[model samples]
Structures are given as C-alpha cells and as structure tokens.
Target chain A: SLEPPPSTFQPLCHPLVEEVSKEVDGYFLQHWNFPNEKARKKFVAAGFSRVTCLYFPKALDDRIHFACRLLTVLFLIDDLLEYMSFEEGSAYNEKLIPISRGDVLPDRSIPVEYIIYDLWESMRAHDREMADEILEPVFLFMRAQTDRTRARPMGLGGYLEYRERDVGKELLAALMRFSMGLKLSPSELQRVREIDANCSKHLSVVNDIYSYEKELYLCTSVQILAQEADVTAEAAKRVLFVMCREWELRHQLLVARLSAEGLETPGLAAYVEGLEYQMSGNELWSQTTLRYSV
Target chain B: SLEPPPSTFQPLCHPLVEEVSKEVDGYFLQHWNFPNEKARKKFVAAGFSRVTCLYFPKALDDRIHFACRLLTVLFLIDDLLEYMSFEEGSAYNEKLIPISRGDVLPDRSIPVEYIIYDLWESMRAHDREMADEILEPVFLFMRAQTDRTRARPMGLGGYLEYRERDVGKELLAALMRFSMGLKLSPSELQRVREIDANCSKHLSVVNDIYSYEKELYTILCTSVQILAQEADVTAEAAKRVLFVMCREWELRHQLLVARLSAEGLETPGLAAYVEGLEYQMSGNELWSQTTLRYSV
Candidate 1:
C-alpha cells in the first residue's frame, strides 16, 4: 500500500545522472587530446557514456570558442594600454581617484574621473531608454578597459574595481531601460519584472556556479546542472523531451511560419501539444538539486 | 776659491714635464669626455704633467691590448675544455679553469680537479705570429668571461685557497708554454722569466688594489693599471718608440728623435757624456750618483 509519502525525501540521483556524468568525462578526454593510454582509461573510469556525452559536445565547443575570443580581447586590451598614457587613462589628479575612474572619456585628454561623474549624472536624469542611449558610450568604455589596463599596475587595479561595481549596475539599468524603451504599462512592467527577476536570479546562480572553482571540470559540471534546473523548474522539461523526440520539430516549425501566406492558417494545436510534451520530459530540475546538494 | 757644491739639490719640475702635464690634462678631457669642469680642473691640479700622462696612457693602452692578446692566447692552453661543451664559449672555460684547475693539463682531457687545465694548455701553445688567428676565438671566449664570471663569487675556497701558489703555477705554466710557442732563444726565455716574476709581483699589487674597494669603478681602475704595467714593462713600448724615432730620423732628424735615438744607440757614449755634462754644468757627477744608486 502506498504509505504516507516519505517526509522530506533525500535528493535522488536520477538514472540520467550517471549517464550525464560519463558523457562529460568522455567529452573532456576527447577535447583535451589526452596523450596517454593511462589518461584515456582515467576518462572512461570517470563514468562518461555515449548518450549523455552528446549534450555537452556543443557546449564544450562553445566554451573553447569563447576562450579564444577572450584571449583576442585581452590582446586588444594590451594595445589600448599602450596607446593611453596613465595620466590620461586613470591616474589624473592622482590624489582623488587612486583607482580606475568611470568610463566616458574616449580621448585621453579628459580625466576618467570626470567622465564617470558625467555618466552617473546622465544615468540618474534620463529614462532608461534615453539613459542607455547616453550610456552606450559608457558600455563601449568598459570594452576598452582591457586594452587600457594591461601591464600597468595602477590601471589593472582600477579596472578590476570598476568592473565589480559596473557590471551589477549596468545589468539592472539595462532592464529598467528596456521597460522605458517599450513604454510598458504598470501591469506589463509587473509581469515582465516577474520573469526578469527569475531570469536574473537564474543567471546569477549560473555565474556563481561558473566561478565556483578555478578548475574547468568542476565549472562545467555546475553549468550543466544549472541549465538542467532552469528548464525543469520552469516545467518546460516535457516540452524539451518532445522536441528531442521529433528530431526536426524546431526546424519544421520555423519553416512553416516563414512559408505561411497572409491570413493562411494551419492546425497548430498538435504542435502545441508536442511542445508541452517536450517541456515535461526535462530532468534538469532534479539534476540541479542533486548537483548542489552533493 | 771654489765653493763646495750645495749640500742639497732640490728637485724642480722640468720645463718639458710642465708642458707635458698641460697637454696630458687636455688629452684626458678630450678622450674621456669629462662631464665636470670642476673635476677636470682638480685633475690638472694633481701634478700629472703631459709626459707622465702620455707615459701612463701609452702604458695603459698597450697593457690592455697585450692583456687581451695574452689572455686570448692563454685560453687555448686547455683543448678539451675549449671544445668539450658548446653550451658556453671559450671564456667560460677560461674563468672556470683558473678557479677550478690551477694550471694547464699535460694531456687534453680534464681531471675533475683540473677543470680549467684543458683550456689553459691550448692557449699556452699560441704565439704572436698566430695572434690574430688565436685571438679571434680566444677574444670571443674572453668576452664571454666578462659576462659569465662577472657575478662569480670569489670566496676563500676551492682552487683560490692557495691563491699565490695557484697563480704562480698558472703564470709560470703560461709563460713557459708561450716561450716554447714563440721559439724564444735561451736569453729571451730568461728575460721572459724575469718579466713574469715582475708581473706576478705587480699582479699581487693589483689584487690588493681590487680588494681595496668593492666598487666596479675602483676594480676597473686597478685592472687597467695592472694591464698597463704588464705591457709597459714588456719590450713593446721601448721597441715602438725606438722604431718610430728611427723612421723619423731617416726622413729628417726631428730634435726629439735625434736626441732619443742618439742617446739610446750610444748608451756608453751617453753615459760618459752625461757625466761630463753634469760635472761641468753643476760641478757634480749627478748622472753617476743616480745611475750608481739605481744599479746598486
């Protein structure tokens, strides 16, 4: 007989967990070009499987692509530092702004501190959309941070401090700016805020996971778990599972929409059902709980 | 009645000496690019006449040239160390040898104790006729020494423990080897031994000078001085001076050369004439007294 449901059930590792773990191990071994038989054996013993492995190959490929992009960006940063002198970049009025000043001054002639103050003032006065337009230059300024700060001890210190404060502020500002740009009603703002808050929270969690360890192995595991949780907690796993079942469902949907003539209709109810089924099959929610708890 | 000669003959600076001093100061200012006018003035005040200045400059330059040459030749003393490792050039072996092995090895191969012996053996076999051929490689090796041994710790240990003994053995070995290479006559070899002994004494003086202060400037000054003494004491300067004067005399005897060459050529004649001149001019045998005391 189904007795009273067990109180406070311990987190269970789904069957997919073992498969996913094996897949990740295989992915690392193959990607890194493990040189020796011993290393290959270690990878296999670590529990990588063929089925779970497919999920992360694209993700791994993307990571490598992003790394190359980051390195290229860093080199550009070096060029910037070489071009901009310290006095013009961040050390102006040495006593007042010991660290890096705000982004705004494109030319080295203007002191960075003054530029930061100007951006802050503009951000406060204008609505998010107008502010963002004004802030576009400021965002560009952050991109230039890498170039202007390389090798120079003082510049490096200033840039890091600026980044920690600026990233949080700009992200929140972007959301506010988007609402204003769209001219959303109060109810609309509330609904959007609800989704936006969830998205932001999930994003923050993902960031924390990525940064949890210095090692890549640990970082990738956290990322997969986080992505799984994001889909499952939203009850979209069934939709994901259905999408997975029909190999070309997404491609077909895109094609159908593009081909439809004006006022032409197609029975889309089946497609909706297929989408819902795909969403419920997602095991991401359980995986996320298992990963963090472990 | 003739009065007795004055009891004391006070030495006065010669007119030539005074003129030479001024020229020497100017020469130093021009060549060394003295930055401070005050320093130049002070140097001039220090009683360095042009003649003395020329003497030392010629001496120093010659010494440096010879030291470079000699050190280059001497580096070939050790064949094994010279060719054994391509990692560092010959100079490394030179420094390593002196501090490791105290003298040239009889055979080319090195003993663990005679680390530098192989290189020194090869250098001893080189001569002046082969100076250019020998020195190019040896100088490259010596140049490497400046950088390699520049920071070497000269502590009271290892081959340097019996410093004088090691230095004497190395010097003797180098000289013997050099004489053999030059195919020196018995007289020449004897002269070389005397020169080596004098140079060894001077090297001790130089070591004292270097150890006097740890500054690079002082060390370099002492090194330059040692090299100057080394070359000047050899026949190079005298030979060069004599040859130049002889050449000038052949064209039209310049007073400077005519007097010098005449004096050098007729040593006995000059001695007798100098005595006569001193006796008549000053009522004293000045030349006899000075020369006698020096000879004694």
Candidate 2:
C-alpha cells in the first residue's frame, strides 16, 4: 500500500525543528500550557520534544499575542486621528502612499504598509499595495474634511456632523476584511465585528460622560440606556462560544497532524489533555459576557 | 577812665548767638533728650519731629547687627597681621604705630596728618577729631585685614594667636587712650581697664570652652569658674556706696550749671530740675562700664 508511508513522517526530528520546538515548549510552559502531572511525566520521558501536543497551547498563545498586536495598531491609528490637524493628516497621507510603494526597509520608513502586509497575508496576496491604496485615500478624505470643519467651534451641530451609522458601516467593512485575513468563519467573523463596534461605542460614551466638568448623571444614564439597547451582551456571548469552539478544533487538528507526521512523542497526548483542561477552566468567556452587560 | 570797655570786652550779645542757641535747643530736643514724660509731651506738641530716635529701641533686640559689625572689624585686623607676617607680640608696635601717627591709613596711603591736628584741637577748640582718630584706625585696620583674610582658613590656632595675652594688652592700651579722649576720671579709667582685662580673659576662656564638643557638665563648670573668678563679690558693697556719692555730686554740678544759664524763660526752673535728673540717669556712664566688661 505504497510502502505504508513509513508509518509516519519525522519532520520534528530535524535539528531546526528540534531547536524551535524546545523554544516553543519552554515558552508554552511559562505562559500557556498549564502544569499537569500526566503531562510533566510524559514530557520528562520524551526529552521535551517538539512533537508534543503542547503546540496546540503555542497556537493559542500566538493568537493572544496577535490580538495584542492588533490592539496596538488600533491605538496608534486612534492617536493619529486624535492629534493630526486636517492639513497634517492630508500631508501624512500624501507621503505615505509613495513611501509604501518604495522598496525601503520597514524600519527605515513608517512601516505601516509592511506591517499590514505581514499581519494580513490575504490582503497582501490579493492586492500587493492594498494597505497604502485603501488607507491613504480614506485618511486623506478624513483629514481634509476635519480640517475644514474643525475651524468652527464645537457644538451639537459639530458633534453630529459625522453620522454614527456611517462610521459603524465603515468599521464593519474593515472588520470583515480583517476577519477574512484571520481565516475566521462567517458567523465567527460577524460576532467579532459586532464586539468591536459595541466596544468602540461603549468607549465613546464613556468619554462623552466624562468630558463635562459638572455632574454627568444624565449623560451616564443615557450611556447605560444605549448599552442596554445594543446587542453587545449577546454578541460577546456568541464570540466567546465561537472562540472556544475554534480553540478546540485547533487543538484536535494540531494533535491529528502531529500524529500523522510521526511527531507524536510521549508528552503529545498529555499535552493535549492539559490544554483541554485549561480551555475548560478559563473564566474569560464568562467575564466577557458580564463586561458587555455592564 | 571808668568807661565801659569795647563791645567785645563788654560781652555784647551777637545776633547769631541767639539764633544758634535756638537751633542748638531744637537739635538737642530732637537727638539727645531722653523721652521722659516732659520730653514726650514736648515732642508730640512739636508734631513728631526728631522721628529718627524711633529707629533704635532702648531694650536689646537681636544682637546680630552689632555682632556682625564687630566680627568684621576683628577679621580685618587678623587678615592684615597675617599678610604682614608680624610675629606674635610684634603686631601692635609695628602695625598700630604707623596707623596712629597719621603716616598711614588702613591701606597705608591716605595721610591722616590733618586728623592728628584735629585731635590736638589746633583748629576746633573742642578737640572733636580725637573721636575720629581713635575710632578710625580701628575701622581701617578691620577693613584692610578683612579684605586680606576673606578666604583664609581660620583654625583654632589662628583664634588663639589673636587672643594671646600680649594682643589683649595692646588692645586694652588702645582702648584706654580712647577712654581718656572721653575725659574719664583716673579711678573711673582704672575700673574700666580692669573690667576690660577680666572680660578678655573670660571671653577667651568661654570661646575655647564653647568651641569644642564637650559634655554639658564640663562646659557648665568652666563657665561657672570663669564668672566666679572675674566678678569680685567681696567689694560689691563698698563700690555701691561710692557710686551713690559720685552720682549725687554729678547731679549737683548739673543743677548749678543749669541755674546759671536759666535766662528769663518760664520753664527754666523745670529745665534745671530735669537737667539734675538727667545727670543721675545718663546711660553713657553705665554704657562705658558695660562696653569695657563685655566687648573685650
């Protein structure tokens, strides 16, 4: 039957894989993979090999790291938007477009295009210069409009100049693209986008409630009402369920792949079992639901 | 032959004399008169003229101003002596002689010959320059020495070198000439000199006693011994009796002088009475004793 494929492949036995595996194992033990008696005993016997099912824990850790990186990018964008005058914003956009097309190293320039390509492989593969093309025009338009409007003193009219409905639609579109790059399912992606939008709305309401010098009881009441009316609580619960299911599916996939590749070392089964316990014990999903309700 | 002598010999009143008398009275009331009940009433009626007297209070306030001025002069002399390298016991003879003879000022450039003549009263009958001559050398020496010694390290040995017995004696000698200029009596001068020597010894002892880090008991005992040795308790009664006699005599002399110059003013009698009181209460006599006892 085609020589039985030599029972299993041994790619993890290669020197490079061995070294990277040990590093990944050490990182998981420190941060992700919880200590289980069975897993520890198994790990000691197998010399802490890369074929261990601990890769599943590594994958989860990487997702969390990626999330933090995404949040950093978001915060940078927020900062740029908040401080840039209309003229400065437009100038930045004009510089950013040509700079992105140049072959300059990421460290030598703004690095926005490079970061977008590296983090969103789908975007880079579909359109080589998609980051610059999409972001530059949007930023330029925002800059020009903000510049013209900012000269007029802020009031109710100024606050209402941009419709919340339009902003929500644009944010949803960006979230859909990001979710596609992250390889999320349709339902999972929609849930994440909803969470993102609700979070932004909640944060904006908090800012509004705090801006007044005097008591903001009425403002706070309206914020509470808005939160009650939003679908954030249901969306957060749905997102947590999807995250759990994805984590479980990823764990099973990593274990099956490692087994077929003949990388199932002594600790492999115990490692998967320990990660399962960790996922089950995690209270963050429940906390997300509660926070969204508040 | 029996006709009155010329106007000069007849003691004819000069118009300026009356005018000057009035000015002198005004100056006296403004500056010198103590603010007794009569003086206060007169001062208020005069619309608060002579307000400068208010600057100094009779009672001692913080002594920092007086102490700093005194220390500055002392430091000046100390610096000059160091700059000249005058051996111990040679300072007064070499440095002080040129200063007194008008051959040198503090910087040894300005000739003080006119000051000497003023001291001798060749021009002014009152011999007022004697005050400036006696005090100016001290000020000059202090200023020059202070400028020279500004940054030099002054250890305990430096302090002792300046306070040696010979240095103290020379200081006392200069002070004696100063007291003589004030026309003090022989007995009064002797008393002041003794007090000066006692004060010098006590001060030197106290400076040493306080300078070191010593136990409280040791410091207290040293101070007590110095006070006991310097103050003569046995002669207190006799000295008190003599002080009363001298005071009465001075008061009588003042009254006599005031009566002779009564003129025709209505308040002349009251003025004479006040003059007699002032003779007994004058602070200068007491201040002289205090100065000799504490300053050295």
Candidate 3:
C-alpha cells in the first residue's frame, strides 16, 4: 500500500473553511464523543471541515451543521469499524438504527450514538418528512457497509449503484429536500432520478480514485476495476479514472436534458449546477485534504 | 353520542378513487385475510377516498396511489387489531412495522404488511427524499396508533406537542414537499413553521371537535373538552370558546401567509403548501359527515 497522507496543512485556507471547522469542533465536543484521539481526527482527516461548508452551503446553517455532523458520523463510523472487533462493530451498527424512532438512551452509549439521535431528533423536529425520508438510507448504508465487509462483496455493477449510498449520495439526496431546495413533480422526479444517480456515480468514483492509495487495504473503485478489468491495481486505477471521466460527459448530457426542461426556472439550472459544483467540489476537496496531499 | 351524522350520502366520487378502491378490493383479497366482510368495509367507511384525494393530491399519481394503499392499510389494521385478541393485535402491530422495511413474511402475515413495503419500495425508487422524510412518521404512526389503542389515551394537551407524528400531519407535511413543490432557506423554514403549526393545530382540533360526541371521537382528543375541564367552564361555553379560537387560528395562519416572503421554493411553492393544508381540513370535514361509520 502507498504511504498515508501528510499531516501538515493550513486547514485548506478557505473563507468559511476555518469558521465551519471551528463550529464542527465546538459542536463535536458539545454533542458526541470520540472513542479515542484517532477517532476524533478521523472526521477531520476525511475533510468534513472543508466538505460540509461547500457541499451544502445553500442548506441552512443549522442544517448544514446537522449534515456536517452526519457526514462526520459516516466517516467516523467507517474508521471505527475497521479496527474494532467484528462482533462489537456489528452490534454498534444494529443499535444505531432504532434511534430513528426517537431518543432512547441505555445504561451506556457511545458519543456517535447520542450524536445520531440528536441529528434525527432535530430532523424530525425541524422537518419530520425529511427526517423519516433520510433515515432508511443512512441506516441501510451503515448496515450494508458492515454486512458487506463481513460478507464483503459486490459484483453486479454493485459499486456504481450502491456506492451512491456507500459514499454520500443517499445522505445528500435526503439533504436535497432542503439542500438545493429541490422539488420536483412526478415526471420531474423521474428525470432527476437518473441524473442524481449519474452525478453520485461520477463523484464517488473520483473519490475512490483519489482515495485508492489510502484505502487500498479496504474496498475501493480501484479494486472493483482490478477485479472486473483483470488488471493490476495500478492499471485498475487508470481504468476507473477513465471510466469516471466518461461518466462526467454523460453526466453533462443528463444535465443538458434537465436543463432544457426546467429552463423557465433558473432553479432547475441552479440544481443542475449544484450537482456540477459537488462533482468538482469533491475532486478539489480530495486533493486539498490530506487524503491525496503529497 | 348524537346519533351519528346520517350515513346517507354520495360516495365522494372521483374517477381515480373509485378505480383505486376496486384495486384495493383486489389487493385485499390477494394478500390480507380480513376477519370479516364488515371488517373490510370498515376501510370504505373511513372515507379514505376523499381524504387521500383531497389532503395529499400534490403527491404525484404514483405517490397518491401509494398513499391510497397506505391509508387503506391504516383502516384495515385498525379493524384487524380491534377484532383480534389483544395478544394477537399487539403481535400483529409489531410485525407490521418490519413490513415498512420490506416483507419477510413470518409464520403469518397481513395484506397491510405487503401494502407498506410496496409504499417504501415505490417511494424509494420514485422519490427517495420523500420516502425517507415520511418514513418515521408513517411507521411511528402505525406503531403509535396500535400502542395508543392498546394503551391508547390522548387527553387534549397530551398529543398537541407531538402533533407532527400524533396526528396524520407527519405524512401530510412530507407530501407538502412535492404537493407544494416547496424548498426553503433555513430562514424561510423559521417563517413557515408557525404557519404550518397553526394549520395542523386548527385542522386537528376542528376534526376532533366535530367528532366530539361520536364513538370515533373517543380514541381522539378534543382540546375544548380539556379546556372545559381545566378552566371549569360550562360545556356549552367550552364549545363556544373552541369555535372562536378556531376562527382565531385561521386568523393566525392568514397572518403568517400574508407575511411570508414566499422565497425559497420552486413553482409557487408556498401557495401550494398553504393550499394543500387547507384542502386537508376541508377533506376531513367532508369525510366525517359523509362516511358511514361516523355518519351512522
């Protein structure tokens, strides 16, 4: 495997970057607990500090912070499950989902556990509809990731489809209720479904390509291509990047199609551009954060 | 209770509703085993036909039918739970929630089980946002109703605070996303919360007040009764105050909408949500007097 990313950086030096990072730090301490220092840094290491401020700016401050918390939870969970005992990890995953109903604290619970209940509680309180809608995907992703790792498999173009959930698309899609302020009619929903999938697919592959060296020990798009294309991990990374770039082109085609349909409202174009922003945003974030830093 | 509003009335006919009703009959036959024909008709008597069509029309056709299916399941579950032994009802209630995830039929299952899975699957596929947003409310409502019935008690003030999930507002509010095509800035959400709350509280109390003396009213809470008890007002005065406050509630909702910046949505979003909330009240109004259960 390649070397880990450098620890040195100026917190990426964006305008809101430092402010949001500070907020995340304050909120993290005020709300959830990190099991260890490594667990705490895992959230920062994933670039949530930069990612949340950019990925969902249009989302209200409270919501963006809420999303930032959720995304950190996702990153933290990914890191936590890796070193922990399988039995312990699996139990933690199962226990997290029921809190979607409402808060129920037991004799002992982790910071992440309380963190999620607070998020869902705010979601239900802030917007019951959005809370319920996002709960399944977040729960499913956690369970699936754990189950997949233990059983650990996905061959049926599974990465592209499930990666949406695997990465952050499922959560982002939920955020769209308030993130981009995306609202669609029945027919309009049909149109965006494919577009959203394609967008998630592109962004996810790019992140995998970027994270390939870092996460090679675990599943990555590099591994999937290596298996499917019958190549070395080096060549697999090449193939994955090329395929993702091609998807970017098709991504434009979908962007164009929806663009025309909703021309009357710049809002449609705004959403279309937001997806574009995310793709570009993910690519930029990958490099700025230590994940791909030289 | 006053002899139930005369049951003689038109069926609140709509082309899709009637069509959906037939499909429901077919669904009922294939998946669920109702305890009796009377139990099956209990759904029709609830007048879900008008409620779904009116309260949640902004949901696309597919979602509407999906909702129609869920509403029918709600009606059936209430009936099925009533007739079954308490253990059976409790057991059945616990099992039905998993169906919201997807059907993994056990030693036995109900049609309502199939109905919810179908809702989530279709919702997840068609609108993941809506599907997830409404999931807690819908599932919790199912669990809540069953628990409430088994342990069912809601004095007026009891559920007002939890009205989003306590009343059907949870699901309906989610539908507002599509029904009204609303999207709001965080600033905007603050603006609308009061309006939406006023609307839900008004509509909820209005329905309960009308049903106050009726048997269906028993399971529900009427704030006026609670007000009467708390304030030591005569029953007549309580009813009068309730009506006057209801008018004031309307005044509050109108005030919010008038003040609304109406920003942060696609395609007349505020107009749509506000209009949709109004329809919910009227739909509830129409169904009670017309549907056989309350009517009889």
Score every model by TM-score.
Answer: 0.19, 0.20, 0.42
Name the lDDT of candidate 3: 0.62
**lDDT preference between candidates 2 and 3, better one:** 3
Q: Comparing candidate 1 with candidate 2, which one achieves the higher lDDT?
A: 2
Candidate 3 per-residue lDDT, tens place, A1-294, comes to 332222211122234566667787668755656667785666555657567666654655556666676776787678668887767888988888776557566323457766777777876887676567677777767776666442223442765777654435656655654544455444555667776788788778777777777663455677767766667877776666667667677777877776767633455566666666666666667656774543
Model 1 misplaced stretches (Cα beyond 4 Å): A1-134, A145-294, B1-62, B70-95, B98-296
Best lDDT goes to which candidate?
3
Against the reference, the lDDT scores of all candidates come to: 0.33, 0.34, 0.62
Least accurate 10 contiguous residues by lDDT in model 1 chain A: A1-10
- In order, the candidates keep a fraction of the true contacts of 0.00, 0.00, 0.00
Candidate 3 segments whose C-alpha is farther than 4 A from its true place = A1-15, A35-47, A103-109, A149-167, A184-187, A218-220, A224-232, A261-268, A291-294, B1-296
Which model, 1 or 2, shows the larger TM-score?
2
Query: In candidate 2, what are the lDDT values of residues B1-296, reduced to their tens digit?
Result: 11211211111112232333344335434443334869545433432111111111121222212212222224223533655543442544345445544455554232222222222232123344544444544544333332422222222234334443324333323433332233344454343332333333323443333322232223222222323333433223323433343344344544444453463332333333323223212322322232312232
True lDDT of residue A292, candidate 2 = 28
Model 2: lDDT of residue A67: 26
